[PDB]
Structure formats: structure tokens, C-alpha cells
Design a protein around this ligand. Structure first.
Ligand code: BCL
Ligand code: BCL
Ligand code: BCL
Ligand code: BCL
Ligand SMILES: CC[C@H]1c2cc3[nH]c4c(c3C)C(=O)[C@H](C(=O)OC)c4c3nc(cc4[nH]c(cc(n2)[C@@H]1C)c(C(C)=O)c4C)[C@@H](C)[C@@H]3CCC(=O)OC/C=C(\C)CCC[C@@H](C)CCC[C@@H](C)CCCC(C)C
Ligand SMILES: CC[C@H]1c2cc3[nH]c4c(c3C)C(=O)[C@H](C(=O)OC)c4c3nc(cc4[nH]c(cc(n2)[C@@H]1C)c(C(C)=O)c4C)[C@@H](C)[C@@H]3CCC(=O)OC/C=C(\C)CCC[C@@H](C)CCC[C@@H](C)CCCC(C)C
Ligand SMILES: COC1=C(OC)C(=O)C(C/C=C(\C)CC/C=C(\C)CC/C=C(\C)CC/C=C(\C)CC/C=C(\C)CC/C=C(\C)CC/C=C(\C)CC/C=C(\C)CC/C=C(\C)CCC=C(C)C)=C(C)C1=O
Ligand SMILES: COC(C)(C)C/C=C/C(C)=C/C=C/C(C)=C/C=C/C(C)=C\C=C\C=C(C)\C=C\C=C(/C)CC/C=C(\C)CCC=C(C)C
Ligand SMILES: [Fe+3]
Lengths: 239, 281, 302
């Protein structure tokens, strides 16, 4: 009868669908590797999908996945054990070296663009007609790290132009130079901006950007990476 | 055994209990202390369910079913074969879930991400504990809890619902269903938006969030935005589960008559109770 | 107080965004609506502009016509009295023709003709809105995923009010327009067919409904958890994987041993949700057309 045909067909459609979905989710990170960089023996039960090409939009190129994979960067870690499956110790300073929760990826060293081709993120000062509309305005507030020591002062907000959203605080140090802190990692309060991830002495270590009115995807990854890493790696200096 | 970008994240640290003792992976899987806890509770429970399966005399999983103590036991223990196995499996289940969440917390700390995933999972655990622990305790017996079997737990859903007429009339249940449906709405829209930007018309180039905002504004006059929709999905989800727990925590406890009749508070309000016409006059 | 990104701490406003122009006929976009500071703690503050071409005016008009048709009947049932109208809001109901009238349009106005009118207006509102769904995507050069997904919702709705009534040979099979009556219809549908818990399509539907809450909780949580790395900028994460996408994948891999890509997830999402009503629609459509009693059917499978 119809209903048991429909149900049986459906479990077949459903297994085909899980197959499609699982292979589609193999377009990044595959083929699997041994801890040493080498293709692993056991690739799992699903084959790689036939590749596909995204056309990027501002003469920015193509992406074709799956494709050859690589960190395009040195990984300062080493084995701590004699077989598969254990942690890999930082061979240096893990914050400086961009590993563990301080990791960053070798994203493209241009800025993300809006639909019109302009830089997506600008310091508010260069963003025409953009002003704070609600909430404590943090500009001018001292910035305090997890040691409860003051690390600098907020000197602008970097805003996403097409989505009208705060993305970073630009913070000035004793130095005179500035750093970006991710908006999602600061707490804005009446008389200060509080940063739990970092202690005051780790502010100078925040990756710097090359031009003062642009950030590249590569630069965002290093900054977000480094301050996220502080949660684990700043923990001895954290009151 | 590793995704091509995985090695750099696989560092020591993050753990909540045990320093570096269980700090390692098996294949793709992290292992908490809470990985070990999760295995112990899960395994014990599965054994105890396989055992419950033989004392009830079946091996097919559409029939296997483990019942709570009958009402007569109140909140007391009960022998293994007559609902104690259930009691212990329930302790194991709680053990395995709470463990799983806490393992999730460990993974979070190692990866330097926020706690949102385990926090969210905690709502599901609370829904479960509302059915098997909080509601029973407030009602005086394990026997009100639902049993562990594929088709038998549905039986319990019917019997519990129909003890109050059409359960539709539970107003907290109405709100809960609202959030489930809305959630699925948002989930369909969210997936289709992102995908329709990433896979445009053909030969055409990837669209942008600006396009996604533009499409939504064109269509309904408003777009919540790429941050918003993720806040939203999270909130609709969790809200659905919250109101699910609410609609059941209040059932058999503060309200125990037919849910349809609760609505009479509205109709019998002074200023219109006795006016004639309409359905209730 | 580590911050969670659930509400924004600082809102930022610039000139109203009029959006991308692609092949969209700009003559048909309203002007920008106001800016809600309320909404903007959670999402975007900007209301409008909306696009309103010909199909859009059709849709919105029959939509209202649907609504006022139900509404005069409701005031009628209140015998024109506002206090009775508010009192009995959820009890009023616009019912379809009785079985006597089969599929005919002969049924008197006051006894199901109004139902058919309301339904007619609802039919054109929904389908025209569907077309609007495709056309707004075409004008922007986007894939048709929204229209495809929405079609899946339309399937349940079509099956319930139009396709199943027709195959059963009468409109009395269709769902009434009312807050409580549609719940009664639903309960009664299940009772009359031997309990929808026995219908394996009903059970699948539940799994996807629950699954949608699972997934969206996972996904929204995951995105928020990696929003400290720009995670919500999913389109650029698709084009050029960042640490956000990586730490996300890797959370699910260490947790449950397999994972998604940033684009991949959205494929899981679109399907999880779409299968709720796909599955659902089949289950209803089969009910009483092929299976009178799910319990019974379940006892033989065939
Ligand atoms: C699926 C099987 C049943 C069914 C079973 C239930 C059950 C069971 C419940 C509902 C509930 C709802 N259903 Mg119903 N519902 C059905 C099909 C429909 C159809 C339709 C096919 O066109 C409509 C318009 C509605 C409309 C409604 C709303 C009254 C409510 C919220 C839906 C929602 O939140 O998601 C869509 C999201 C939106 C944002 C659009 C909402 C628009 C509505 C008109 C406003 C809601 C608030 C209202 C004033 C109270 N149902 C079919 C026939 N529906 C819940 C409720 O509270 O009912 C009292 C509830 O418990
Ligand atoms: C005939 C029956 C009654 C009825 C009676 C009830 C009753 C009775 C109940 C509900 C509940 C619900 N009903 Mg009602 N309901 C009816 C009609 C409906 C209709 C409808 C279209 O008509 C809808 C949409 C709903 C919807 C709902 C939801 C609000 C809710 C179910 C979700 C939930 O609580 O999840 C929360 C999620 C969980 C509890 C899952 C917990 C998961 C745990 C933490 C993890 C497990 C891990 C697993 C073991 C590991 C697997 C191992 C590996 C995968 C291998 N009801 C009819 C009228 N309904 C329930 C509720 O509100 O619960 C509080 C409830 O008890
Ligand atoms: C939530 C309100 C009611 C309830 C009402 C219903 C109703 C109504 C239905 C189900 C259905 C299901 N319910 Mg139930 N269910 C409840 C609580 C539970 C709990 C629990 C630990 O709290 C579990 C584990 C389940 C599990 C199940 C599955 C057997 C089935 C698919 C659910 C799903 O896809 O979810 C979404 C989750 C995912 C997609 C993740 C994958 C989940 C997998 C499939 C879970 C498998 C569990 C395994 C069989 C049992 C554990 C064995 C382990 C070895 C220990 N329900 C409470 C009591 N449940 C449907 C069914 O088809 O029943 C036959 C159905 O119609
Ligand atoms: C006593 C009640 C019966 C029962 C009877 C039914 C019946 C009857 C049906 C379901 C259906 C469903 N049931 Mg059941 N259900 C029961 C028990 C349960 C339980 C449980 C006990 O826990 C649960 C979780 C469910 C859950 C569900 C859902 C999975 C499924 C509906 C999917 C959906 O998204 O609908 C919502 C989606 C829609 C209604 C489509 C909407 C699309 C249209 C196009 C939107 C029009 C909008 C309109 C223009 C208004 C616009 C206003 C705006 C604000 C502008 N049922 C018991 C056994 N259930 C449905 C199903 O698929 O079953 C197989 C169904 O028909
Ligand atoms: C916010 C609420 C929504 C939600 C969220 C949610 N669920 C989650 C998460 C989150 C955020 C996870 O991070 C976690 C996960 O890792 O998912 C992949 C998870 C999860 N939710 C799951 C299932 C699940 N979630 C459900 C619901 C929901 N989850 C809600 C709708 C349901 C429903 C709706 O029915 C189910 C069935 C798992 C896939 C996973 C948790 C896996 C886990 O905790 O593993 C630990 C334990 C075991 C492997 C062993 C089994 C335990 C044994 C002791 C025996 C069995 C006990 C008994 C209760 C059996 C009953 C039998 C049934 C027939 C009734
Ligand atoms: C895959 C399954 C899920 C799903 C998907 C889904 N729904 C969809 C879509 C998709 C993909 C759309 O693209 C479409 C959409 O545009 O979403 C925004 C839609 C849609 N789903 C909707 C509703 C809906 N979806 C539901 C469910 C679901 N849809 C499933 C869970 C439900 C449920 C669960 O019951 C409902 C009620 C709409 C928001 C929209 C369909 C729009 C449409 O067809 O509308 C025609 C136009 C009108 C009817 C105008 C009428 C307005 C009046 C009736 C209201 C009056 C009050 C108000 C205006 C007061 C303010 C005063 C003013 C005068 C100022
Ligand atoms: C952008 O971000 C995102 C990602 O990536 C970029 C992601 O991938 C994901 C993940 C999303 C998916 C992969 C989509 C698929 C998800 C579902 C539809 C949910 C369904 C879940 C299941 C069907 C299976 C659940 C599997 C479990 C719980 C594993 C159990 C299997 C075992 C063998 C046990 C594991 C081992 C134990 C007991 C733990 C301890 C280890 C020892 C062995 C000791 C999301 C949400 C995300 O948003
Ligand atoms: C304040 O008062 C005023 C006057 C302003 C107005 C107030 C109005 C109010 C209060 C309205 C309330 C409306 C409500 C409560 C509506 C509820 C709707 C609900 C709950 C559910 C609807 C389910 C509907 C379904 C499933 C209908 C599907 C319909 C179809 C699939 C179309 C059927 C096609 C037909 C019948 C034939 C005509 C078509 C052709 C091609 C000939
Ligand atoms: Fe997303």
C-alpha cells in the first residue's frame, strides 16, 4: 500500500540526504592528517565531494573547495608524548606565537569589503554620519585589564558600515600607539571599560595593524586570536 | 585523525578537574575528566537497561521499556525489577548529561570560545529534570515520571495530556508551541538566506550581508541582521524549552483540572460576564 | 561579568541604508521607516525600506481581505457588541460548509460560503507572497533557497485546507478559522484517525521540529561563542575560513566527533526545518485518503 511505499521511499531519500549533507561538510579540513601533516590512513566512510567554485566579488578571485590545504604559517608546537592523541606543547610564548586559544588563521591580507566595494569596517571618525546612538559611549573611558591596572584609553570605536554595528574599540597605550580590542571582549561600565582577557602588560603584545584606517582579515584574526588566548594564558596575572 | 588545521589548537589546558590527567583525545574526541565521567554513567546506564531488558523478557528495541516505581512507592526506593532500575538509570542519565555539559565547558576553555553551547544544553537537561525529577517530587511519586522506551514514552505523553482534556488549552503549552514553530520558521529562513547569498544565480558572484539585509527589507520591511538572527535562533530555542518546562511544572501541581476551564477566569470577568450574545452568553 | 553578546552594549547609527540595487526596480521601494533603539539592543535598529510592486499590493490586499472576512463574521457572532467581542475572541470560529455540500460552492453565505471566501483570499495572498519570495531573490541575483523552503511550509498548509479536502470529496474536512476551534479541529483529527502518534510521518515531523530547536540552539550558541572572532560574518568565513569557523568546527569535532563547515551548517539548517513540514504534509495527506486508522495500519505496517 501507498503509505508503506511513501515511508520506505522516504527512509531512502533520507539516507541519500545525510550522505549529501555529510560530504558537503567535508569541503574544508579534508583530507584528514596525522599529527605530522601527512595524509592519514583512515579517511572515514565518505569520499570528498566534487569541488565547487565560489566567485568572489570585487575582482577578489575564486575559491574552489575541496582544494589543497595548508596553514600558510609556522606552528610553534611540539609533541609531549610518544603516540597519537596527546596535547602539543607551545615551544615558545603561545600568545606571541599564535597557537592554542591564541591561534589565528592565514586569512587574506585585505579588508573585508561591503557590497559597494568600500572597506566594511572603519574607525567611526572616518565614517560619515556615524555616531553612537544608545548605551554608554566608551570613547574617552580608561581601559582596565584583568590585573586591575589601567592599560590605556579608548580613542575611537571601529564600526561595521553596512550592518551599523560596533566591531572594535581602538585603545591608546602609554606609548602613544593604538590597538584594536574586539567589541565582544570588553565590558563597558560607567567609569571604565573592563577587559578580563588581558592583563595590562599584555596590551603592547596585541598584533598591530599596518594602516590606521583599515583592517585586513589577516589582521583581525591575529587580534581576536591574541586577546581570546589571554583567557588561558594571562591567568597567572588575573586577580 | 586530524582536520588539516587542527594541530595548532590541540594544546594542554582548559581542564576543570584533574590537571593534565585526562587531557587528551581518542580519535576526534576530546576526553574530559568529564569524558571519563560521561563514559562511566553512560555505560552503567546502558548495562542497567540491557539488564532491565532481560527481567522484562525482550531484546527488540521497539519493545524494551523501563518503568518508574508505581505510584504506591511514593518517593521511596523500589526493587530493581519494579522500578528501581529506573531510579538508577535516571541517576545515570542525569550523570551523563551533566557530565557532557561540563566536558563541553572544558572544550570551550581549551578553544578560547564562549560558554554559550553548554549553557544552552543546560536548558535541555532542565526540561528532562522537570519531567523525571522536579515534577514527580512536587507531586509525591516517581510514578508520574515517564518511562524509558521508544513507543511507551509516547503512551505517557497521551495519558498525561488527556488527564487534562485537550492539553492544547494549557496556556504555557500554547506559548511553548509558538516558540517551536517560530524557531523552525527562523531556522528555515536563516539557512536559506546565507545559502542563497553564497550560491547565487550562476556565473554570478557571491552576494554579501548587504544583499541579505536588502532581500529581507525588500520582502517584509525589516531585517534583523547577521548578529541578530543568531541571538534570535538561540533565544527562540531556549524559550521554547523554557515554556515547555513551565507548562509541565504547573501541571498536576498548581493546576490539575481540565485545562480548557482555566480560560473561564477571562470570560467570567465582571465587566462582561453577564452581557448576552456571542458564544458564552 | 564576562560579556555574552546577547544584547549590544553600544548602538551605533549612520545614514539610513537603502540597500543594494541590483536589478531591483527602485521605483517600488518605499522610503526608509524609523529607527528603533529598542530593536537595536538585539538586532538592526532600521525599519524599512520595503518593496511593494504589483504582486506585493495584490498579496497584502487579499491578506487583509482574508482577515476582514474572518473579522466581520466574528463581530457578527458577537452580535455587533465590542465587550462580547473581546470576551469571546478565542471562541468565535468561521467554519467550512457541512459535509452535505461536498465540494460545491452552493453553501449559504452564513453557513460556509464565507469560509470559502476567506479561503479564496487566503489562497491568493499566500501564493502571490510566494511569487514575491522568488522575485525579490531574482532581482538581487540570489539563489532561490527562500522560495524553495517556503514552498515546504505551503505544502502542509495546502494539504490541510485544499488538497486533502478535495481528495476526501468535501470542504467540511478543512480547518476552521478561529483560535480555539483550530485546536479542537487538531485534537479531533488525531482522535478520528486512530492517534497521530501511530503515523510514522507524524513521528518524523516531531523529530525535525525538536531537531530544529536542537540545531538552532547549537548553531546560534556556536556563532555567538565565536563572535569574538567575527564568526557571524558567515559569508566571508565561507569565502576565506578564519579562526571563528575553525574553532567552531573543532568544538563539534572534539565534542561529538564529526563536524560542519560554515556553509555546510546552513545546509543542515535549511533541511532540518524544511523536513518538519515536508514529512508533516505527507502524514496529513495520507490520513483518511489511504489510512483511516494509524493504530490499525501500524499493526500490519502494510
Ligand atoms: C499544525 C496543526 C494545526 C495547528 C496547531 C496549533 C497548535 C497546537 C498551537 C497552534 C498555535 C498557533 N497557531 Mg495553529 N495550527 C495549524 C495551522 C495554523 C495556521 C495555518 C495553517 O495557516 C495558522 C495561521 C496558525 C496560527 C496559529 C497561531 C494562533 C499560533 C502561533 C503560530 C506561530 O507561532 O508560528 C508562526 C509565527 C509567526 C510570527 C506568525 C504568527 C501570526 C499569528 C496569527 C499571531 C500569534 C499570537 C495570537 C494572537 C495568540 N496555525 C494546524 C491546523 N497551532 C499555538 C497557539 O497558541 O494557539 C492558541 C498552539 O498551541
Ligand atoms: C496527546 C498529547 C497532548 C500533549 C501533551 C504534552 C505533554 C504531556 C507534554 C507535552 C510537551 C510538549 N508538547 Mg504538547 N501535547 C499535545 C499537542 C502538542 C502539539 C500539537 C501540534 O498538537 C505540539 C506541537 C506540542 C508541543 C509540545 C512541546 C511544547 C513539548 C515537547 C518538547 C519538549 O518539552 O522538549 C524538551 C526536551 C527534552 C525534555 C529532551 C531532553 C534531552 C536530554 C537532556 C538529552 C538526551 C540525550 C539522549 C539520551 C542521548 C542519545 C544518545 C546518542 C544520540 C546515541 N504538543 C497533545 C494535545 N505535550 C512536553 C513538555 O512540555 O515537556 C516539559 C510534555 O511533557
Ligand atoms: C519532549 C516531550 C516528550 C517526548 C515526546 C516525543 C514525541 C511526541 C515523539 C518523540 C520522538 C522521539 N523521542 Mg521523545 N519525548 C520526550 C523525551 C525524550 C527523551 C529524553 C531523554 O528526555 C529522549 C532521549 C527522546 C527520544 C525520542 C526518540 C526515540 C524520537 C526522536 C526524537 C528526536 O528526534 O529529537 C530531536 C533530536 C535529534 C534529531 C537528535 C538525535 C536524537 C536521537 C535520534 C535520540 C535517540 C535516542 C535512543 C533511541 C534512546 C536512548 C538509547 C541510548 C543507548 C541510551 N524523547 C518527552 C517525554 N518524543 C518521536 C518519535 O518518533 O517516537 C517514536 C515522536 O513523535
Ligand atoms: C491532540 C493533538 C494530536 C496532534 C495532532 C496533529 C495534527 C492534526 C497535525 C499535527 C502536526 C504536527 N504535530 Mg502533532 N499532535 C499531537 C501531538 C504532538 C506533539 C506532542 C504530543 O508532543 C508534538 C510535538 C506535535 C508536533 C507536531 C508538529 C511536528 C506537526 C506540525 C508542524 C508545523 O510546523 O506546523 C506549523 C506549520 C504550518 C501550519 C504551515 C503554515 C504555512 C502557511 C503558508 C502560513 C500562512 C500564514 C498566514 C498567511 C497568516 C499570516 C499572519 C502573519 C503574522 C502576517 N504533535 C497529538 C497526538 N499534530 C501537523 C502535521 O504535520 O502532522 C503530520 C498536523 O496537521
Ligand atoms: C535548548 C533545547 C534544545 C536542545 C539543545 C541542545 N541539545 C544538545 C546540545 C544543545 C545546545 C548540545 O550541546 C548537546 C550535543 O552535544 O548535541 C550534539 C545536545 C544533545 N541533545 C541530544 C538529544 C536531544 N536533545 C533534545 C532537545 C533539545 N536539545 C532542545 C529542543 C531532544 C529532544 C527534543 O527530544 C533530544 C532527544 C543529544 C544528541 C546531545 C547530548 C548527548 C549527551 O548528553 O550524551 C551524554 C550521554 C550519553 C551518550 C548516553 C545515554 C545515557 C544513558 C544513561 C541511558 C539513556 C537514558 C534514558 C533517558 C533513555 C530514554 C529513552 C527514550 C526513548 C525516551
Ligand atoms: C519549513 C517550515 C516552517 C516555515 C517556513 C517558512 N515560512 C515562511 C517562509 C518560510 C521559508 C517565507 O519565506 C515566508 C516569509 O516571508 O517569512 C518571513 C513565510 C511565512 N510564514 C508565515 C507564517 C507562518 N509560518 C509558519 C510555519 C512554518 N513556516 C514552519 C515551522 C506558521 C505556523 C507554524 O503556524 C505561520 C503562522 C508568514 C510570516 C509568511 C507568509 C506570508 C504570507 O503568505 O502572507 C500574505 C500576506 C498577508 C496575509 C497579509 C495579512 C496581515 C494580517 C492577517 C494581520 C493584521 C495585524 C497587523 C498588520 C497589525 C498592525 C497594524 C497596521 C495597519 C499598521
Ligand atoms: C559554524 O559552526 C558550526 C560547526 O562548524 C563550523 C559545526 O560543525 C556544528 C555542528 C553541526 C552539525 C555537524 C550538523 C549535524 C548536527 C545534528 C543534526 C545533531 C544530531 C546529532 C547526532 C545525530 C549524533 C550525536 C552524536 C554523539 C552525541 C556522539 C556519540 C557517539 C559516540 C561513539 C560516543 C562519544 C564518546 C564519549 C562517550 C565521550 C568520551 C570519550 C571516550 C571514548 C572515553 C554547528 C552546530 C555549528 O554551528
Ligand atoms: C478588530 O476587528 C477587525 C474588524 C479590524 C478585524 C479583526 C479580525 C480578527 C480578530 C481576525 C482573526 C482571525 C483568526 C483568529 C484566524 C485564525 C486562523 C487559524 C488559527 C488557522 C488557519 C488554518 C488555515 C488553513 C489550514 C487554511 C488553508 C487554506 C487553503 C489551503 C486554501 C483553500 C482554497 C479554497 C477553499 C478554494 C478557493 C480556490 C480556488 C482556486 C477556486
Ligand atoms: Fe548562521
Amino acid at each position: 500500500d501507498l503509505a508503506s511505499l511513501a515511508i520506505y521511499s522516504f527512509w531512502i531519500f533520507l539516507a541519500g540526504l545525510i550522505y549529501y549533507l555529510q560530504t558537503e561538510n567535508m569541503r574544508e579540513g579534508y583530507p584528514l592528517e596525522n599529527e605530522d601533516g601527512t595524509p592519514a590512513a583512515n579517511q572515514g566512510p565518505f569520499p570528498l565531494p566534487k569541488p565547487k567554485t565560489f566567485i568572489l566579488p570585487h575582482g577578489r578571485g575564486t575559491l574552489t573547495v575541496p582544494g589543497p590545504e595548508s596553514e600558510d604559517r609556522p606552528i610553534a608546537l611540539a609533541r609531549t608524548a610518544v603516540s597519537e592523541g596527546f596535547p602539543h606543547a607551545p615551544t615558545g610564548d603561545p600568545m606571541k606565537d599564535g597557537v592554542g586559544p591564541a591561534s589565528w588563521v592565514a586569512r587574506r591580507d585585505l579588508p573585508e569589503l561591503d557590497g559597494h566595494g568600500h572597506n566594511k569596517i572603519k574607525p567611526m571618525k572616518a565614517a560619515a554620519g556615524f555616531h553612537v546612538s544608545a548605551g554608554k559611549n566608551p570613547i574617552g573611558l580608561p581601559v582596565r585589564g584583568c590585573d586591575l591596572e589601567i592599560a590605556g584609553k579608548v580613542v575611537d570605536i571601529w564600526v561595521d558600515i553596512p550592518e551599523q554595528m560596533a566591531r572594535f574599540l581602538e585603545v591608546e597605550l602609554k606609548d602613544g600607539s593604538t590597538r584594536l580590542l574586539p567589541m565582544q571582549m570588553v565590558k563597558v561600565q560607567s567609569n571604565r571599560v573592563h577587559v578580563n582577557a588581558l592583563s595590562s602588560d599584555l596590551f603592547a603584545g596585541i598584533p598591530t595593524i599596518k594602516s590606521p584606517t583599515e583592517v585586513t582579515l589577516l589582521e583581525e584574526d591575529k587580534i581576536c586570536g591574541y586577546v581570546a588566548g589571554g583567557l588561558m594564558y594571562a591567568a597567572p596575572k588575573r586577580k | 585523525a586530524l582536520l588539516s588545521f587542527e594541530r595548532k589548537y590541540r594544546v594542554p589546558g582548559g581542564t576543570l578537574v584533574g590537571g593534565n590527567l585526562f587531557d587528551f583525545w581518542v580519535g576526534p574526541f576530546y576526553v574530559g575528566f568529564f569524558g571519563v565521567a560521561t563514559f562511566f554513567f553512560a555505560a552503567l546506564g546502558i548495562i542497567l537497561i540491557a539488564w532491565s531488558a532481560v527481567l522484562q523478557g525482550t531484546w527488540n528495541p521497539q519493545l524494551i521499556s523501563v518503568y518508574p516505581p508505581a505510584l504506591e512507592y511514593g518517593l521511596g526506593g523500589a526493587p530493581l525489577a519494579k522500578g528501581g532500575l529506573w531510579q538508577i538509570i535516571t541517576i545515570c542519565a542525569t550523570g551523563a548529561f551533566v557530565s557532557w555539559a561540563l566536558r563541553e565547558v572544558e572544550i570551550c576553555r581549551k578553544l578560547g570560545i564562549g560558554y554559550h553551547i553548554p549553557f544552552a544544553f543546560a536548558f535541555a537537561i532542565l526540561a528532562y529534570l522537570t519531567l523525571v525529577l522536579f515534577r514527580p517530587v512536587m507531586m509525591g511519586a516517581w510514578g508520574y515520571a515517564f518511562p524509558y522506551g521508544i513507543w511507551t514514552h509516547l503512551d505517557w505523553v497521551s495519558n498525561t495530556g488527556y488527564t487534562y482534556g485537550n492539553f492544547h488549552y494549557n496556556p504555557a503549552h500554547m506559548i511553548a508551541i509558538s516558540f517551536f514553530f517560530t524557531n523552525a520558521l527562523a531556522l528555515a529562513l536563516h539557512g536559506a538566506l546565507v545559502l542563497s547569498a553564497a550560491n547565487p544565480e550562476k556565473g554570478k558572484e557571491m552576494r554579501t550581508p548587504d544583499h541579505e539585509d536588502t532581500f529581507f527589507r525588500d520582502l517584509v520591511g525589516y531585517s534583523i541582521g547577521t548578529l541578530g538572527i543568531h541571538r534570535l535562533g538561540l533565544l527562540l530555542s531556549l524559550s521554547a524549552v523554557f515554556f515547555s518546562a513551565l507548562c509541565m511544572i504547573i501541571t498536576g501541581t498548581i493546576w490539575f483540572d481540565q485545562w480548557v476551564d482555566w480560560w473561564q477566569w477571562w470570560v467570567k470577568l465582571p465587566w462582561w460576564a453577564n452581557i448576552p450574545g456571542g458564544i458564552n452568553g | 561579568a564576562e560579556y555574552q553578546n546577547i544584547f549590544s552594549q553600544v548602538q551605533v547609527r549612520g545614514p539610513a541604508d537603502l540597500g543594494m540595487t541590483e536589478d531591483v526596480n527602485l521605483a517600488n521601494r518605499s522610503g526608509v521607516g524609523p529607527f528603533s533603539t529598542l530593536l537595536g539592543w538585539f538586532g538592526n535598529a532600521q525599519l524599512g525600506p520595503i518593496y511593494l510592486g504589483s504582486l506585493g499590493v495584490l498579496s497584502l490586499f487579499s491578506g487583509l481581505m482574508w482577515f476582514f472576512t474572518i473579522g466581520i463574521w466574528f463581530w457578527y457572532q458577537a452580535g455587533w457588541n465590542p465587550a462580547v467581542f473581546l470576551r469571546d475572541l478565542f471562541f468565535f470560529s468561521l467554519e467550512p460548509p457541512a459535509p452535505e455540500y461536498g465540494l460545491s460552492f452552493a453553501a449559504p453565505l452564513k453557513e460556509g460560503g464565507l469560509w470559502l471566501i476567506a479561503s479564496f483570499f487566503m489562497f491568493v495572498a499566500v501564493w502571490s507572497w510566494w511569487g514575491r519570495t522568488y522575485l525579490r531573490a531574482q532581482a538581487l541575483g540570489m539563489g532561490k533557497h527562500t522560495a524553495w523552503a517556503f514552498l515546504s511550509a505551503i505544502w502542509l498548509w495546502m494539504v490541510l485546507g485544499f488538497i486533502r479536502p478535495i481528495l476526501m470529496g468535501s470542504w467540511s474536512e478543512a480547518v476552521p478559522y478561529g483560535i480555539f476551534s483550530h485546536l479542537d479541529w487538531t485534537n479531533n483529527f488525531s482522535l478520528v484517525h486512530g492517534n497521530l502518534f501511530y503515523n510514522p510521518f507524524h513521528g518524523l515531523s516531531i523529530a525535525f521540529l525538536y531537531g530544529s530547536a536542537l540545531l538552532f540552539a547549537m548553531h546560534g550558541a556556536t556563532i555567538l561563542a565565536v563572535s569574538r572572532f567575527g564568526g557571524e560574518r558567515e559569508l566571508e568565513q565561507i569565502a576565506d575560513r578564519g579562526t571563528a569557523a575553525e574553532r567552531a568546527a573543532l568544538f563539534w569535532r572534539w565534542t561529538m566527533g564529526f563536524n560542519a563547515t560554515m556553509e555546510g551548517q546552513h545546509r543542515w539548517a535549511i533541511w532540518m526545518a524544511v523536513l518538519v513540514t515536508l514529512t508533516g504534509g505527507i502524514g496529513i495527506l495520507l490520513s483518511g485518503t489511504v489510512v483511516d486508522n494509524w493504530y490499525v495500519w501500524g499493526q500490519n505496517h502494510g
